Design an enzyme around this catalytic site. Structure first.
Site, short mmCIF file in Angstrom:
data_model
loop_
_atom_site.label_atom_id
_atom_site.label_comp_id
_atom_site.label_asym_id
_atom_site.label_seq_id
_atom_site.Cartn_x
_atom_site.Cartn_y
_atom_site.Cartn_z
N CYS F 76 16.72 -49.02 -5.40
CA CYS F 76 15.72 -50.04 -5.84
C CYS F 76 14.75 -49.25 -6.79
CB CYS F 76 15.13 -50.45 -4.59
SG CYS F 76 13.78 -49.22 -3.87
N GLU F 77 14.60 -50.07 -8.00
CA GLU F 77 13.61 -49.47 -8.90
C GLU F 77 12.33 -49.16 -8.56
OE1 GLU F 77 12.62 -53.51 -11.49
OE2 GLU F 77 14.51 -52.28 -12.06
N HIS F 78 11.96 -50.00 -7.52
CA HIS F 78 10.52 -50.00 -6.87
C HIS F 78 10.29 -48.51 -5.99
CE1 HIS F 78 11.67 -54.34 -7.27
NE2 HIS F 78 10.49 -54.27 -7.92
N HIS F 79 11.35 -48.40 -5.15
CA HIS F 79 10.98 -47.01 -4.41
C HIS F 79 12.07 -45.93 -4.49
CE1 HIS F 79 9.13 -50.22 -2.32
NE2 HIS F 79 8.34 -49.51 -1.82
N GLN F 117 18.33 -56.32 -6.46
CA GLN F 117 19.28 -57.01 -6.18
C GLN F 117 19.73 -58.48 -6.99
OE1 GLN F 117 20.30 -56.96 -2.01
NE2 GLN F 117 21.52 -59.12 -2.46
N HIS F 145 18.33 -53.20 2.58
CA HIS F 145 17.32 -52.42 1.96
C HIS F 145 16.39 -51.28 2.73
CE1 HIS F 145 17.83 -55.12 -1.75
NE2 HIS F 145 18.19 -55.79 -0.88
N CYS F 147 14.34 -49.64 1.72
CA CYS F 147 12.98 -49.32 1.66
C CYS F 147 12.19 -50.30 2.44
CB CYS F 147 12.65 -49.88 0.28
SG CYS F 147 13.01 -51.56 -0.32
ZN LIG Z 1 12.29 -50.51 -2.48
#
Ligand SMILES: [Zn+2]
Ligand SMILES: Nc1nc2c([nH]c(=O)n2[C@@H]2O[C@H](COP(=O)(O)OP(=O)(O)OP(=O)(O)O)[C@@H](O)[C@H]2O)c(=O)[nH]1
Ligand SMILES: Nc1nc2c([nH]c(=O)n2[C@@H]2O[C@H](COP(=O)(O)OP(=O)(O)OP(=O)(O)O)[C@@H](O)[C@H]2O)c(=O)[nH]1
Ligand SMILES: Nc1nc2c([nH]c(=O)n2[C@@H]2O[C@H](COP(=O)(O)OP(=O)(O)OP(=O)(O)O)[C@@H](O)[C@H]2O)c(=O)[nH]1
Ligand SMILES: Nc1nc2c([nH]c(=O)n2[C@@H]2O[C@H](COP(=O)(O)OP(=O)(O)OP(=O)(O)O)[C@@H](O)[C@H]2O)c(=O)[nH]1
Ligand SMILES: Nc1nc2c([nH]c(=O)n2[C@@H]2O[C@H](COP(=O)(O)OP(=O)(O)OP(=O)(O)O)[C@@H](O)[C@H]2O)c(=O)[nH]1
Ligand SMILES: Nc1nc2c([nH]c(=O)n2[C@@H]2O[C@H](COP(=O)(O)OP(=O)(O)OP(=O)(O)O)[C@@H](O)[C@H]2O)c(=O)[nH]1
Ligand SMILES: [Zn+2]
Ligand SMILES: [Zn+2]
Ligand SMILES: [Zn+2]
Ligand SMILES: [Zn+2]
Ligand SMILES: [Zn+2]
Ligand SMILES: [Zn+2]
Ligand SMILES: [Zn+2]
Ligand SMILES: [Zn+2]
Ligand SMILES: [Zn+2]
Lengths: 184, 184, 184, 184, 184, 184, 184, 184, 184, 184
Positions: F76-79, F117, F145, F147
């Site tokens: 995931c690009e966020h975490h 996703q 996920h 995360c």
């Molecule tokens: Zn994430």
């Protein structure tokens, strides 16, 4: 843990791998990752005494207690990739029983560190032994490792089981056997 | 291996069985078959020392480590047809533990050859006994054989289990039994 | 087998139960039935030596080999109605292993006869013993019987288990237990 | 099929991949491989008319007949590696129904060739159409491909579904839907 | 049914297939076989009105009634080998409902004969139509055929579904769909 | 990708979180992590034309092709934490069909990047549309996920489904429906 | 059994519970109830020798025979409500084996009475002991009790297991254990 | 209900079937049976108004509410034998929702009587309709019948589905389909 | 129990947590809560002698009786949150057997109190011991704890097993093992 | 909230129900209960804006996003007993997509209050409709209620489904149907 330093490191990490740190969805990433890793490594900064609290009660009996299916998540010290699954704990009290949830708190204390599954089972068992001093403790850790699933050998059906047996669980084969039977 | 010779043999194989190597769908087949077989027999050219990659770490405990469900694919030396399934490995360290992924690499090294399932189990176990010098090792191979399913007796529900026990896994009956129980 | 005689018997069988051998759907039935029974009783006409056809190789190890789930179909000698299920075989070699598919061919040799499930297990085990002279052999047969399901008692959830243990499988309780466990 | 030529090609194959044709275990392999491939490609040498064997009967009704779970085994024309699974057939007769086993015989006739799964489904459907001239026929093939599992991408959880719809199965949405629903 | 003639035919059958009609285990077989076949073909000698026993009651409502999982056993008229499975019945009453067990008695009446699965479905549906004259009736028969499993093509995973839709079940797409949905 | 720079970054990362970069098990970590991330982001450096190779063949029919269960792993690009599961692909060819494994290669090309996703499903569908120009393509991605499992909300039973429908899969609801039905 | 008296008692029963013995749906109930109870208590009027029908054959071997999953239905003597489930039987012959279906006939003989599950197990075991005089016999009865489910405590998830071990099954721990293991 | 009369009837019932009311295990049976039937027929003596006991609240939304899996036990009016299973209820409110548990209390009110499954579904639906006057109600009852299992036809795999659809559940096909789907 | 005082405490509870006791939906809550807690703690007010109700009968044999899957519900004394699951009971009589439902009544007597799972198992075992004075009794309690799921550690996959073994169940390893095996 | 007042009320609750607040195991209970309830009602004090944390990103496509299996725990306002299960969310974006984890945070915000399941679904859906302004949203809540299981009607197999459809999920029937299908 210096969050500012992690943010800078994560920011540089993003560009080196070929990404744009200035991209919309990545702007808050360095910060999000810093907080994530602080939480994922918080186990190092916990104290077994605080984790257990005062949840040690008098034994209601001398029979085995089994707390199974305590899910856990950890990071392999080799690749910094997650490995996870469940921890199963069994013990025969000498005179004191532990609050059920404390088993979960102990698992998290050691899981939220950089680990190797073999060590995780041992540290969990030792922590319980230290807190209760029971006739014996048995710990079984079963997990899947992303480092061998999403890369490297890329095996998909594999699972690893590690264990630690202390006291009567190490001595009496019949006791260890009864504990393992409860897990099936 | 000589891909050009494999391609020539494969092109002729197509002709003899009644096919047309000139067909659109078969044009690149001899080439694909040659490369495939080079990959499927690469195990003969691998070195155990390089496969391990020096991933031998100090033991964290004395308890049994079980790496189960390592999927494998091999070819039977009798019909050159695939047989596949899973490999389950159990061992008790003696100061040394192996990197989890290396077990999968050892499996592939011996599976990617022409084999007999009884041998595959022994070779995997002996390779682990050489790399790490543990108190004992146990290997269980469970597979389905296409030479029994898509031809010959054409049995559909059959599965074969072969194994190899070394050290305490062969000596201590309760140890072997405990390893096998973890697989159920 | 005299296909012509079976055909005449089958034609009369159709008449006595109240059917018409002359109606469209039954025209080729006496012939089909004749051929079916020739196949279903072919086991009597086979020879173990030819069934095994060599396929006996030197042992790769001393550990147990388990070939489970070999489906089989037979006919009870009491009602001439099918009984079927699976045959599981286990053995410890004494210098010689058998080609996996030969176990299936042996199963069929004895299954394709008029049988008693208790007998079937023993004959399969004895055939394996004669061919390999292994340290021990264990055969478990599990089946459902139509003579118990479609008529008579008409029980639906029942299945029967029969077995034969020779050599070390009979003498060594732990070896037998290990074999049976691989079946669960 | 020239078995002698296949054995020669197979013997040279063993040499080229790095093996010893002189090995005790490989001595009879060329012969085994030759026979195996003659069987695995026998479909090219079969005739639809002989396969059906006149087992076409007057329809008993106008409702859909679904023969599901017909296991099949084939070889991909691209890598000469096995792909297998099940074929599900559905059709609505127009005066004629087929002997149930003939569907299996038709499946095998087209499966025992070098194939692409998309074609296998089509040829099976067209064969049925030709033999019964039904109101419609639908075929669904579901298989796993070893060329995707043993090598290349090495994906483990994947399966492919291909189909062919003719007559009312192609023209009537509800009919096709009813057929697909029966498969779930 | 002439049991004496059946016994004589069966005794000769044992002789022709190569068995010993005089051995202890086969002495009572001709007798057991004769009785078995009288029972297995008893459906020919039954009549719908006696089978129903007047167990027809006034409709309690207008919604469909679904009686599923009625196990059945029959004999294919082509090979005289058993085919079995389950029959699922659905109907919308028109002022009359049937005693639940009578659906089972009707199934047995048509199953205990030489049959073709396609016909079995139609006949069960027509018997119900006649007794209740409902707005509609649907019958789905799902079974495995030993003539396909223990001989011939020897496929192991296949099952056949046949059906018969009358009245509103044939004409109303949504009614038929609702019925089939209850079976999943 | 500069591996040396990643090694230095990972080395500093280890100390900031409270670990000892000089510790036995962490010595080779910075290197192992560098290689891991190079592989985990290799998707950015791949070309769709090279990934597909020349595996575009003439259509064997006009029926839907479904390739389900293609396992995937992403970040995931966020975490920068892994999310994984399976990708299911369905398409109706216009005149060209794709080699089955190429679907898996396309999935890996986009999965081995920093993602969301929702985007993954779209990029996969667009890539297939671009390569085959079929009547329509349908892509369903289902994953878990880490995360939201190993941190944050710490939900355990959750799964996310994202999709992308192009051409006839976006237009005809009945087509999209049939594709989704094959997945259940 | 005096069916006339049962009918009168049942008619009065309907009156006492508050129903209308004269309404259409209950007119034939006294009659149906009387017949039902005659059937449900028919076991009292049966005799072991006629039930066995001389179906005792010479032992084919010395291993245990296990007939499991024999469904049974009985009535608790305490509430006159049904209790049902399955009976599993195991025995080691002493020169004599029993026709498989006779185990079912024996189960029904003792089940079709007013019972207590503990007694049912013992009586089945003793009936077998008497007929075969085997080295040992084991019987396990597992059932659900409606008197516990539809009234009283109204527990829904419970099942009761009762057993009876005779001869070697009672005295030989490993024999009893092997038998119970086959049931799992 | 006159417990004393039921007790006297039950005592005589014991005698006529060949039992002894005086033996230890049957001493308290007439009393136990009397009380059991009082409970089993209590539904006749309940009032809907009191069963609901208010517990009718203003609607929170307009969407469907589905209360599935409400287990029930009843007695067929034909044989006085138990039939049981589950009741699934669905409804669209019209300004009023019901306390979840009241659905169960209503089920019991009608189940605890002598019944016909077709009637049971209708009465439950009508009771819900009278209490809530919702836009629509749908009730599906699924059960197994002991009168079909422990006697008579003695079928084991059968279960019956009956239902009642009122208001929009009867009128709106899509609403009905949505309700039934939530049940799969 | 002072219901009036409970209602007052509950009404103040609603105010303190931030809710409105005047809300239409909470008006009857204090009354409902009061009644609920009186029921949930009724176990303190029950007497073992009344719970058993003299349902102690002469033993029918000397074999083990296992009553498994007795669902239970309790409240942890630590958080006053529910914990629930199943209780499995095993015992070998010494002349006396207990009515099956009494085990359920004993379970409820101790479950409907504030408890710790370790104590619940012990009290149930001791209660049985007191009532039957059997050769031995074993109790296994398996439950999920909402205080571990709804709050605190918020673990989702965990379950706890506690037990109590008396007499031969404590003294005889094989007896206890046999009992535990029945539970798997 | 006032923990001191909750503790005082809880201590008195213990006394009234018949317990001893002075007991070792109950000493810290009033304190634990107060903190627990503060946590269980924290949803009333949360702000939707803060819960989202600005995790609203630009839409990657127009296809449906489904977040299923979000476990939830709540308390019924009627009995103050827990009801729990899972929440499934489906929506079609309109330029905006939400961070996956925020759906779980929104669920907890409304679940951690005193509730009715019908309301919980509506509030969750309305919260999503406000945060993101998509074409439509669909929420399905499936839960088990302890107030129906551990007291009152004591039903064990029941489960309740409630939902809320907004925008296209309420308008477009095929969209709602597609969302629901993804849940099966
Ligand atoms: Zn994430
Ligand atoms: N023990 C063992 N036997 C094997 C393996 N792979 C393999 O093909 N075999 C056996 O090797 C034997 C070779 O038999 P054979 O020389 O008569 O050749 P065949 O093709 O006619 O045999 P078949 O038709 O029965 O399969 C077969 O029985 C085959 O099952 C393996 O891994 N282990
Ligand atoms: N539609 C249908 N066909 C049936 C039934 N039972 C049954 O044997 N058949 C078919 O009747 C056909 C008879 O074929 P055939 O006259 O060539 O006889 P065969 O024994 O050589 O056929 P086989 O070896 O393929 O089974 C078979 O295809 C068989 O599957 C049934 O219930 N329905
Ligand atoms: N549509 C379809 N494609 C197939 C079948 N069997 C089969 O190998 N293929 C595909 O044929 C293609 C051949 O690709 P290629 O000429 O580049 O050869 P390759 O060995 O390098 O492919 P790979 O490594 O991706 O498997 C593969 O993508 C393979 O998945 C089949 O039945 N249907
Ligand atoms: N051991 C054993 N007990 C049985 C069987 N059938 C049967 O009803 N019982 C028990 O017989 C006992 C009779 O108890 P009781 O005389 O107090 O009658 P009751 O109806 O008030 O009991 P209950 O309401 O607890 O079910 C019950 O505990 C019941 O469970 C059986 O097969 N074995
Ligand atoms: N052995 C045992 N421990 C129990 C039971 N029920 C129960 O709550 N406990 C434990 O009692 C302990 C009370 O711990 P505590 O006094 O520190 O309170 P807490 O609410 O902060 O604990 P927590 O947040 O870890 O759940 C918890 O660890 C809880 O798991 C039970 O049946 N057996
Ligand atoms: N629709 C709905 N009803 C609920 C919920 N939670 C909850 O307790 N109820 C119902 O609220 C109603 C309150 O009924 P009542 O005022 O007669 O109280 P009671 O305790 O005597 O009811 P009971 O014994 O039938 O459970 C019960 O029928 C209960 O099932 C919920 O989330 N939705
Ligand atoms: Zn790693
Ligand atoms: Zn082979
Ligand atoms: Zn028989
Ligand atoms: Zn291929
Ligand atoms: Zn046939
Ligand atoms: Zn009873
Ligand atoms: Zn009835
Ligand atoms: Zn607690
Ligand atoms: Zn409630």
């Amino acid at each position: 843990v210096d969050l500012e330093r992690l943010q800078a490191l994560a920011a540089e990490w993003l560009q080196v791998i070929g990404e744009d740190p200035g991209r919309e969805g990545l702007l808050k990433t360095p910060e999000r990752v810093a907080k994530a890793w602080a939480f994922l490594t918080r186990g190092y900064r916990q104290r077994l005494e605080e984790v257990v609290g005062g949840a040690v009660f008098p034994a209601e009996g001398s029979e085995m207690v089994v707390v199974k299916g305590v899910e856990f998540y950890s990071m392999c010290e080799h690749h910094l990739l997650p490995f996870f699954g469940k921890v199963h704990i069994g013990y025969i009290p000498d005179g004191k029983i532990l609050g059920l949830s404390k088993f979960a708190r102990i698992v998290d204390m050691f899981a939220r560190r950089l680990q190797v599954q073999e060590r995780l089972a041992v540290q969990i068992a030792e922590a319980i032994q230290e807190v209760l001093e029971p006739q014996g403790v048995g710990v079984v850790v079963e997990g899947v490792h992303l480092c061998m699933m999403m890369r490297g050998v890329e095996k998909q059906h594999s699972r690893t089981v590690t264990s630690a047996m202390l006291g009567v669980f190490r001595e009496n084969q019949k006791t260890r056997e009864e504990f393992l039977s409860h897990l099936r």
